[PDB]
Amino acid sequence: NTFEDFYLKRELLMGIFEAGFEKPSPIQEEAIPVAITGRDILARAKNGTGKTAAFVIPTLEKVKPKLNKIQALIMVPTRELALQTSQVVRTLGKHCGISCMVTTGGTNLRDDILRLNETVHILVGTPGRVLDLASRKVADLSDCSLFIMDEADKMLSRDFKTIIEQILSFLPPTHQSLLFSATFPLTVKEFMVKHLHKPYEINLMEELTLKGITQYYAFVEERQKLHCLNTLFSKLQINQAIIFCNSTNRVELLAKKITDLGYSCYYSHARMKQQERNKVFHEFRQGKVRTLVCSDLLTRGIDIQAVNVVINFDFPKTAETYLHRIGRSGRFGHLGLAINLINWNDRFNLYKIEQELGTEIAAIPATIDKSLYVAEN
């Protein structure tokens, strides 16, 4: 339940806890052990899920302060992401005795060259600039056995992909590569096959499945939504449930209302600090409460096994969002229930999402068969 579990350097744990980090995000929890193993990683990651610390923590663990060489290279497409990355490195690694340098475009090349006169353990930078410094022989990447790409798709388009390959020529032939990307077009997939060794893959499916999820809709007006939900919860045999709303404020308001009715729940939304969201994920997965009200998931689709009922309190506008809410990546035998609260204004999107996803969302029956969503799990 804590970063202490990962058996990390005392000094690294100090920086983690002093930075207000406590419980890892799903991507951090999965990626950290894998990176410590020495595996290559290819990970679909979205923003606001703590992907930066997922690679920075293993980097700080592996890097040896006593060796006066660049041991990790973190590639990023923009200066803004370089600065966000170095902030995490210097915060989490406050007590580690490790030195980080940023090198990007839109800065004085001269100042980066003289900085390299002094010790750099972790180099964070953009393709053009990093290649520039490597080719001039100012940045010595001969011991740089850890290679990281953050937003790999942006740096693996046709006008950047050759630059990345040229940078890899300066690394030791044997290196670990951790790549994180939101999308996986042809050029990205080609690079991965060529330049990763049997990578551990996180969330790479591409299209979530609705198989085993029986989907219904209850026609309601806005004022009925709470009472419809209340009625359903009194009748359904819920293990755990997740309820989606379309705004962070509606998340909070609904959570308050059901709490007042006496339902055990947490809420989680995108305006919360990352670390507060991680806390909810862990305690909800532990089964400390029955219900999670949220605006979205930290994970890609629900992967809490005990959730057998999912409610769209507000119906989404697009098929993409519907699928991300109701679809899943693994456990293909799983059976669950999804109920959509549909007002008059959702009528078009209802038909549109059914069509685009090639799925059925039938009118909710008076009684729902338990075989559709209750197992001996």
Complete DSSP assignment for 145-210: -EEEEESHHHHSSHHHHHHHHHHHTTS-SS-EEEEEES---HHHHHHHHHH-SSPEEES--SS-B-
Q: Is 52 annotated as a binding residue?
A: yes
Report whether 200 contacts 40 (CB < 8 A): yes
Q: What number of residues does the chain have?
A: 377
Distance, CA of 291 to chain centre: 21
Q: Is 47 annotated as a binding residue?
A: yes
Q: For 200, how many CA atoms within 13 A lie in the half-sphere containing its CB?
A: 16
Cα(77)–Cα(128) distance, rounded to whole angstroms? 10
Nearest to 272 by CA among 68, 54, 12, 48: 48
Residue 187 CB: number of other CB atoms within 10 A? Answer: 15
Q: Is 51 annotated as a binding residue?
A: yes
Under 8 Å CB-to-CB from 137, ≥6 apart: which residues?
none
Report whether 92 contacts 20 (CB < 8 A): no
Q: For residue 143, is it left (φ>0), alpha (ψ between -120 and 50) or beta?
A: alpha
- What is the DSSP secondary structure assignment for residue 66, as one 8-state letter? T
Q: Which fold has domain 206-377?
A: Rossmann fold (3.40.50)
Nearest to 184 by CA among 165, 203, 164, 163: 203
Q: Is 53 annotated as a binding residue?
A: no
Q: Is 279 exposed, middle or buried (0-12, 13-18, 19+ CB in 10 A)?
A: middle
Distance, CA of 161 to chain centre: 24
Residue 229 CB: number of other CB atoms within 10 A? Answer: 23
Under 8 Å CB-to-CB from 7, ≥6 apart: which residues?
none
At 293, which helix (H) or strand (E)?
A: strand 291-294
SS3 of residue 291 by DSSP:
strand
Nearest to 33 by CA among 55, 11, 52: 55
Cα(228)–Cα(215) distance, rounded to whole angstroms? 16
Tracing tokens 């697009």 back to the chain, one arrives at 318
Q: Which two tokens stand for residue 71?
A: 């041991």
The residues with which 209 forms a beta bridge, in sequence order, are 328
Cα(287)–Cα(267) distance, rounded to whole angstroms? 14
Q: Which two tokens stand for residue 18?
A: 């002093």
Q: For residue 238, is it left (φ>0), alpha (ψ between -120 and 50) or beta?
A: beta
Residue 332 CB: number of other CB atoms within 10 A? Answer: 9
Tracing tokens 């009748």 back to the chain, one arrives at 235
Domain boundaries defined on the chain: 1-205, 206-377
Q: Is 20 annotated as a binding residue?
A: no
Q: Is 49 annotated as a binding residue?
A: yes
Q: Is 48 annotated as a binding residue?
A: yes
Tracing tokens 């045999």 back to the chain, one arrives at 237
Cα(14)–Cα(34) distance, rounded to whole angstroms? 22
In Å, what is the CA distance from 283 to each residue of 14, 24, 236, 257, 291? 23, 12, 23, 21, 11
Pairing mode of beta strands 307-312, 336-342: parallel
- What is the DSSP secondary structure assignment for residue 364, as one 8-state letter? P
Report whether 116 contacts 65 (CB < 8 A): no
Nearest to 67 by CA among 13, 122, 113, 12: 122
Dihedral angle, C-alpha 35, 40, 45, 48, nearest 10 ° = 30
Alpha helices in the chain (DSSP H): 10-18, 26-37, 51-62, 79-92, 109-115, 127-135, 152-155, 158-168, 186-195, 225-235, 248-261, 274-285, 319-326, 347-357
Report whether 59 contacts 72 (CB < 8 A): yes
Cα(125)–Cα(105) distance, rounded to whole angstroms? 9
SS3 of residue 59 by DSSP:
helix
Cα(288)–Cα(189) distance, rounded to whole angstroms? 40
Report whether 350 contacts 324 (CB < 8 A): no
Report whether 35 contacts 146 (CB < 8 A): no
Decide whether 1-205 matches 206-377 in CATH topology.
Answer: yes
Cα(303)–Cα(205) distance, rounded to whole angstroms? 14
Q: Which fold has domain 1-205?
A: Rossmann fold (3.40.50)
Tracing tokens 């309820």 back to the chain, one arrives at 243
Cα(196)–Cα(177) distance, rounded to whole angstroms? 7
Under 8 Å CB-to-CB from 304, ≥6 apart: which residues?
240, 242, 284, 285
Q: Which two tokens stand for residue 19?
A: 């930075």
Quoted resolution (Å): 2.1
Tracing tokens 């388009």 back to the chain, one arrives at 157
Under 8 Å CB-to-CB from 370, ≥6 apart: which residues?
237
Pairing mode of beta strands 362-363, 213-219: parallel
Q: Which two tokens stand for residue 127?
A: 């393709």
